[PDB]
Design a protein around this ligand. Structure first.
Ligand SMILES: [Mg+2]
Ligand SMILES: [Mg+2]
Ligand SMILES: [Mg+2]
Ligand SMILES: [Mg+2]
Ligand SMILES: [Mg+2]
Ligand SMILES: [Mg+2]
Ligand SMILES: [Mg+2]
Ligand SMILES: [Mg+2]
Ligand SMILES: [Mg+2]
Ligand SMILES: [Mg+2]
Ligand SMILES: [Mg+2]
Ligand SMILES: [Mg+2]
Ligand SMILES: [Mg+2]
Ligand SMILES: [Mg+2]
Ligand SMILES: [Mg+2]
Lengths: 108, 87, 140, 196, 110, 151
RNA sequence: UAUACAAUUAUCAUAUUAAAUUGUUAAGUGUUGAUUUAACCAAUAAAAAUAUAAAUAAUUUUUAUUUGUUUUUAAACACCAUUAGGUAUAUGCAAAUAUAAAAUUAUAGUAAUUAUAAAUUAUAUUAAAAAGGUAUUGUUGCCCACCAAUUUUUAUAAUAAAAAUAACGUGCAGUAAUUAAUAUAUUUAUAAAAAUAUAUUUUUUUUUUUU
């Protein structure tokens, strides 16, 4: 998992306010896809699926969270459209009907 | 009317008391000065009570017993009884 | 001058004020007008006097023989209201009465919900509207 | 006479007994105050205390209504700007000023449209002040405590169900999984408060 | 409940004041309640009411010679058997035995 | 952790604040006692001495170990610093509660006297001659509002 | 010293014609790692969804019954403490605002009152416009507890309680007031008070009639 704190990009820096920002999500996703292609071609070469040329990876983008870092993330997928082909965009975002207590904030 | 201030008159208008001490006490602000308070004694049903009252009176040649009357309020908190004459 | 405002209300602000040519209702209006001038009455009081004045027995049920929704025609009202200001000596120059009473109505014709009024602001009361927003006022 | 009946020579004319003990109330309602401005408690426009009120809470969103200057604001031309953007992004060999002409036409109209909407909205402010606004004279309806009586009516009901006993009482919150962590003999779901 | 909800009259405002208490008044009385409760805690008060005894009259166990906090004041005179039993009660209240229901503990309870 | 307090201070304050600071030493924290507000240098050390001689009195009975670190005797600051013992191996190897004693006091005293005399300013503030209204309650004689006798 | 409440609408502790109680569901492994936080430290992470009708109205339940404290962590979150843990939510006990009352305080002798709400108080992104005061020429405004003396009443709990009070020393609790306050509950403690669990505005508002 390539993470905004895993890639540098986070600490000892500008601030927390901008930590979960759009452009960080973009940096992370675009850094991840770059490293994702070759390993995909290797995992396929292992079972004998060459995917030599003129092929796209059929992708399902599952998105969680309703936070700023989402927007930018998907953008870094869209500029890879010549490599990756998105069939389905479905977001899995947990909804709390009720459940165990969340951590107590300041006021309540 | 405040009926609990009269506790030591015991249903009487005036009292007879004996002099013991005379000390001074400072009134509630914004009134400054020294209020003279006489500490007196009297007996009822063979009980000896110490009464504490405001000395407004005129002392002449040395004398012992006073006549106590109740008033309205005064500068000094806690002192209900006043002095009429000294005998 | 507030007189013209009052008369505008009696003309346009009242559904079915009977037949306003008849000497009875006409005299009601005349007297009340002369009582708004010379300050003998509040405008509000004279208006509530006008609309509560005695007209004719079973008034509504005679009104069902003329009107559908109880809104009469406004010509009799304006002709009477000009007539009263002329016969009373209200203005030095005769025409001014009619002109002003007419003009103030024509300007209000363009306004949203023109012939209804909030009861508090309609007449003299403790709290008032600013002179621009007053209703039949010259400053609108 | 020459001015309002609710305002005499020295200020607002003091009717209730509150005015005679507190006659600062007659001459000062705030920093938007002038002398002609007494008895008309709302002050001019664009001015301090000029805002009209609706059931007591002032109307500060007017532009947001007609969709001038809001985040939700109405947009006149979209198809044009998108069309032109598409043109710019596609290729550089052919340049289309046809699109930029349709667009600048669109804008040229938009100006007058907007001035019209603004004017109509100021007329709305005037009308709203005349025929609707109470001039900050009635109690707020917009926060839950103002509706306390309503909630009371509901508490009362849950009390009469409980044999007219526990007012304002609610069921004890149990646990995330109270039902399946408890043994036979203990209450596994939260009961009515009277039932405890 | 046994103890007092309030101390003094906490709802004194003018009639039709649309709350039980004002902020000011409730703060005053919160102060007085605070002082009393703090006194109870630090002096280590203990009361008891025993079955088959007059109930309104409560034996004050915090004044008992064994459990007395002061080294000076004469505590109280309570029956030898009964006082032994009270001492045992206070002592075996302290700690949580498993299977028993958890009950709030404090420094001042000992 | 730094504790700053004034020059004029009650016995009371000395007591509870002493217990506080020692309880803070017990947890291994940094402890510095500072006077940045004082009438005279002599007074300032009067109080530093008071607080310290209360501190060892209390901390020896509960037996928590700390060594005296730093005395800074200065123009604007009169201060002492204590360091706790790190472990129970540190408490058993070095078992000491180590304080300054008359020599270190009096020496950094004269050093403060000279340091303050050199700058020409002997304290941040000094007491004022103002007498606030004071009731004494019961008296044997006439007394003016400030609490003084009548000649 | 004696010398005329209300009975049409009054907020703190004397309830009372009421339909509930019982339901076994969910969730869990691939692999080499900077998650959460304003900031520290411990260190597998996923999760627990269904019930209406019906019960008749009043006249002797008031020593009866009843008002959010609850076995099981070998199950978590949460909270409390800090690398060594505690706790983790209605089978014992537990009457209690929803008002029947006669000026404030005070265990029902202490001080002489108290409480209270709309006047006034310059900056919250409209084509400049909405805002609070325990102060009263008003924040350099007021106030809060402990910490000494004394005064006075008594139902004497570490060091009695309560009331008057004008020192000294800590602070800075309160006036949406430097983590909003208020009430109950439980814990904590130099001192105002602070932490958590519920209710709540005597706190300032931000507003999707199937997209
Ligand atoms: Mg009597
Ligand atoms: Mg007097
Ligand atoms: Mg204003
Ligand atoms: Mg409490
Ligand atoms: Mg009752
Ligand atoms: Mg348990
Ligand atoms: Mg005494
Ligand atoms: Mg006392
Ligand atoms: Mg504060
Ligand atoms: Mg606070
Ligand atoms: Mg605060
Ligand atoms: Mg509170
Ligand atoms: Mg504290
Ligand atoms: Mg509290
Ligand atoms: Mg709180």
């Amino acid at each position: 998992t390539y993470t905004a704190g895993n890639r540098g990009l986070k600490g000892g820096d500008r601030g927390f306010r901008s930590e979960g920002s759009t452009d960080n999500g973009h940096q992370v996703t675009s850094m991840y896809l770059n490293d994702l292609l070759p390993k995909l071609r290797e995992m396929r070469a292992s079972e004998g699926r060459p995917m030599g040329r003129g092929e796209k990876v059929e992708l399902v983008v599952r998105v969680m969270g309703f936070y700023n870092g989402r927007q930018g993330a998907v953008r870094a997928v869209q500029d890879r459209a010549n490599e990756f082909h998105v069939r389905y965009f479905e977001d899995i975002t947990p909804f709390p009907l009720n459940g165990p207590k969340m951590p107590r904030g300041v006021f309540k | 009317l405040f009926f609990l201030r009269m506790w030591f008159l015991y249903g009487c208008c005036l009292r007879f008391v004996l002099f013991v001490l005379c000390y001074y006490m400072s009134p509630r602000l914004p009134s400054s000065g020294n209020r003279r308070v006489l500490y007196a004694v009297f007996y009822l049903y063979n009980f000896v009570w110490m009464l504490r009252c405001f000395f407004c009176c005129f002392i002449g040649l040395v004398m012992s017993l006073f006549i106590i009357e109740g008033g309205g309020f005064v500068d000094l908190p806690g002192v209900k009884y006043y002095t009429r004459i000294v005998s | 001058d507030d007189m013209f405002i009052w008369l505008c209300h009696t003309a346009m602000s009242v559904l079915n004020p009977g037949d306003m040519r008849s000497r009875l209702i006409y005299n009601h209006l005349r007297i009340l007008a002369e009582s708004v001038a010379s300050g003998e009455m509040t405008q509000r009081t004279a208006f509530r006097f006008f609309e509560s004045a005695v007209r004719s027995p079973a008034y509504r049920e005679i009104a069902k023989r003329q009107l559908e929704g109880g809104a009469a025609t406004r010509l009799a009202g304006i002709s009477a209201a000009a007539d009263v200001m002329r016969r009373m000596g209200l203005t030095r120059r005769p025409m001014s009465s009619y002109f002003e009473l007419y003009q103030r109505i024509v300007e209000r014709s363009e306004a949203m919900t023109p012939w209804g009024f909030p009861p508090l602001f309609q007449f003299e009361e403790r709290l008032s509207l600013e002179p621009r927003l007053k209703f039949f006022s010259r400053a609108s | 006479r020459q001015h309002d009946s609710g305002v005499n020579q020295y200020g607002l004319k003091p009717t209730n007994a509150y005015d005679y003990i507190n006659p600062t109330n007659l001459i000062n309602f705030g920093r938007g105050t002038t002398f002609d401005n007494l008895g008309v408690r709302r002050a001019g426009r664009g001015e301090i205390d000029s805002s009209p009120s609706h059931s007591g809470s002032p109307v500060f969103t007017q532009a947001k209504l007609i969709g001038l200057s809001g985040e939700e604001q109405l947009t006149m031309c979209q198809s044009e700007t998108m069309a032109l953007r598409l043109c710019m992004a596609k290729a550089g060999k052919e340049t289309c000023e046809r699109e930029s002409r349709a667009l600048d036409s669109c804008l040229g109209r938009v100006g007058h449209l907007r001035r019209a909407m603004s004017e109509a909205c100021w007329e709305f402010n005037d009308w709203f002040i005349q025929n609707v606004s109470d001039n900050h004279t009635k109690p707020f309806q917009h926060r839950p405590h103002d509706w306390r009586h309503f909630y009371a009516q509901e508490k009362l009901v849950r009390e009469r169900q409980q044999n007219g006993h526990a007012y304002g009482r609610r069921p004890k919150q149990f646990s995330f999984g109270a039902r399946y962590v408890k043994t036979d003999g203990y209450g596994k779901r939260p009961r009515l408060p009277y039932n405890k | 409940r046994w103890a007092a909800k309030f101390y003094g009259q906490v709802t004194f405002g003018p009639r039709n004041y649309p709350y039980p208490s004002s902020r000011w008044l409730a703060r005053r009385f919160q102060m007085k309640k605070h002082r009393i409760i703090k006194r109870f805690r630090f002096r280590r008060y203990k009361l008891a009411a025993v079955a088959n005894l007059p109930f309104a009259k409560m034996i004050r166990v915090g004044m008992l010679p064994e459990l007395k906090s002061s080294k000076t004041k004469r505590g109280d005179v309570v029956d030898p058997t009964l006082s032994g039993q009270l001492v045992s009660a206070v002592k075996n209240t302290g700690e949580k035995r498993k299977g028993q229901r958890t009950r709030p503990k404090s420094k001042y309870q000992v | 952790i730094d504790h700053t307090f004034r020059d004029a201070v009650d016995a009371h304050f000395v007591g509870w604040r002493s217990k506080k600071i020692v309880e803070d030493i017990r947890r291994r924290h940094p402890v510095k006692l500072t006077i940045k507000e004082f009438q005279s240098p002599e007074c300032a050390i009067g109080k530093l001495r008071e607080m310290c001689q209360a501190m060892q009195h209390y901390a020896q009975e509960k037996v928590i170990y700390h060594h005296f670190t730093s005395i800074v005797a200065n123009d604007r600051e009169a201060s002492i610093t204590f360091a706790p013992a790190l472990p129970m191996a540190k408490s058993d190897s070095w078992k000491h509660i180590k304080y300054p004693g008359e020599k270190e006091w009096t020496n950094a005293l004269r050093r403060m006297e000279d340091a303050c005399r050199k700058s020409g300013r002997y304290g941040t503030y000094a007491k004022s001659n103002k007498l606030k209204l004071r009731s004494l309650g019961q008296t044997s004689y006439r007394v003016d509002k400030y609490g003084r006798k009548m000649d």
